[PDB]
Amino acid sequence: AEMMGEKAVGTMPHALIITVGDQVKAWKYFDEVIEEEVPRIALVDTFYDEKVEAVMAAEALGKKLFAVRLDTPSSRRGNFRKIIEEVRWELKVRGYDWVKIFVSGGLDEEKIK
């Protein structure tokens, strides 16, 4: 980032949530400890389904939750598209609508298209 003159951005590791021992407690600690200028994207999928952990992250920090990250493991990606939609729904239904969908995890052109 530096050598270019840019700020290296990022989100949350699985390690953080696992060592802290609790999803909610984890992204709570992140919300408080890290600077405010740092968008807060919650690393959903860890123990519970993305659908479940997504709303949890919403009903916590609520408007502090800039986005939710989906990185479903390959053994679990039956239909990423569908999975992504289901999250958007469970969020939309429960009135959470500002939270965006951020994804990462082994993807190329065809997968992104």
Add this chain to the structure above:
Amino acid sequence: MKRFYIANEDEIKAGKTTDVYFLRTKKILEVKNIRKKVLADVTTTSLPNNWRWGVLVGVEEVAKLLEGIPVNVYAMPEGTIFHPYEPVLQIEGDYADFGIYETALLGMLSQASGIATAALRIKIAAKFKPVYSFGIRHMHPAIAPMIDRAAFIGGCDGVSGVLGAEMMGEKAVGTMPHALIITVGDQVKAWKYFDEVIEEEVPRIALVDTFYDEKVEAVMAAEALGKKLFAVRLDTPSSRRGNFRKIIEEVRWELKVRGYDWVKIFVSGGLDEEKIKEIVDVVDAFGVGGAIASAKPVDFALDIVEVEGKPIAKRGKLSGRKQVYRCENGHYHVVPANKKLERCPVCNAKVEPLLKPIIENGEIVVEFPKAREIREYVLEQAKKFNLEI
């Protein structure tokens, strides 16, 4: 006692045909007494062959099943074009009460919807020309009617099944068997006997291909009953169908050359969409069997999406009580019931709700349309929405 492994109307209405683990579910709930109100959804995450749309069928029988049971049943009008993830029917009440009716209700919507969708697609592929259901011979007679009634609602002009025809209020149509011509021992003598013995209101289609080539027997049937010969039927056996299209043309020619021009070409015999598409423009009417009767069911599933006004559903299932709004341009939209549409998100148009109450506390608050008018509904949607095969 019972000579056929079928279920009696009572045993089904009873719930004797369900999966045991549902009975055991009523036990746990009843004993440990866990009574509570839930809203269950009926949808599919896919349609056979990954088709884009399907034809809803069976809403009737389902009402006649949950009839007189502690629940509410909202639904889409039978024959409605639907899609994956869109609830085609909902149920509200104590799971402990209706949960023992999944095995039956889903089966009722599933196979019917399957056959219908199949049918409508064939209709479309046949450029809406006439198509007659002939497939009940490939399935158990017990369901002979549900099938023909589905092929019908699906777009089939007529039905082969007798008992099935009636229950709908239709005349079962048909043609000539190979047995007739073979026992009678002579092609000509056979369709002559048919011309005289059978009523006059019955179109007379000659079963050509039997011993001689279709080309030969076609003219014979023409130079006999001549103007009494409404059509000729071609059902070339697979071992003989080198190029059905070509064979169909050759018949038309040999007939046209010899001045016979009123006789139409009616075909039947193991054919689906792709097969019909390559032969529509040269055939007058289609006889379809298995592709419609043996069509694949729609993987319909019943899943609780809300418990006590609380939005909750398992993995891969949508949560909450919802409605599906359809505009006159076929654009659908599934949204939460907590909101209400009026404008069509896409091409601004008036949109109307599809989930409507059909059973209020075990009471069927609706009059169910007769088959033919539902079928009227399917074909209108097909054309209005410009459905594509």
Add this chain to the structure above:
Amino acid sequence: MKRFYIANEDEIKAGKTTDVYFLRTKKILEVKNIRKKVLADVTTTSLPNNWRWGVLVGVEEVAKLLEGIPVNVYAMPEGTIFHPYEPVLQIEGDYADFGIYETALLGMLSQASGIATAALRIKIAAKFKPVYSFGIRHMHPAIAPMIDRAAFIGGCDGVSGVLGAEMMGEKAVGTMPHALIITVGDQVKAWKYFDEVIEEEVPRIALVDTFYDEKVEAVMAAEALGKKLFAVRLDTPSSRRGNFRKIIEEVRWELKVRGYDWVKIFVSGGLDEEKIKEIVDVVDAFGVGGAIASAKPVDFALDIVEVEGKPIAKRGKLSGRKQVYRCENGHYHVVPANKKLERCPVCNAKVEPLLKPIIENGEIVVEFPKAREIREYVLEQAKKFNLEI
């Protein structure tokens, strides 16, 4: 009057469910009085997906249908492995008498045979491990039993359907629904209630995947009832099945690591041969639905191959009265009845006739084996003949 579009046992035995053109055939023949003795054959020119063999099913119901009718009915023992062009059942008499029973008899042999063959193939693909029929939810309840009875004869160890289980003389097995766990509101609380409320003779398989990952809920179910947990069920939704194999292993691991080693892996959920083949060696028992219940019928057809001792059949159909000889090495041989085999054309062995009399002039000259013993017959053939999927 009737609340479901099904046919009553009487209407079927009557012949009210046939294709009109068969009635009209009786008219022509009866009126113009063309009575004569004929021998009709029942075969297929192909099996679904161009499979090599199929499992014969329905010989029973057919006898109970032609019962009390002016004809003879020879057949192969229900459950027999058969092939294309080999008559699985014959009928002798005045076509005018039984001809109105094609629509019913063919459907009876066709769909059953279809489901059975499907089942047996699944059995084989699963390395004969246990497989339980769960598919009746995708078809009409009216036929719920015929199906489960077919999945059974096919090789399925157990059946989900209650009414279907009984009529055979079997106990309908099952596990846990998603509804149970969701209404109860808690995974653990749910399978706890099940462990206490349900009988002890009922194996206890925990329905894992619901809200949490299978990996998480698997151990939970273990650290609860511990040695009461006979098995864990995996039915990952399609949107979640990235690599079922891998998912199945991960569960086995997380269980093995935490010292739980008696708990087996039971899976179910949209699976066929290819899917099972890629997961057999890591699963204990299979739960199969649609691939067996919604299996495709066997294109069975009834064709007169002889009229008045005279050999005659239409195009693409074999002519004459014949028999099929089978040796103990599965080598089949269809030959004319005018001749008799004793030696097996191939590996010289003793061969025995398959077409045997079952109905003498409307009189059922046979006692029909109970389901389970027929099934005994299928699996024995599968192994003896070394059937390949």
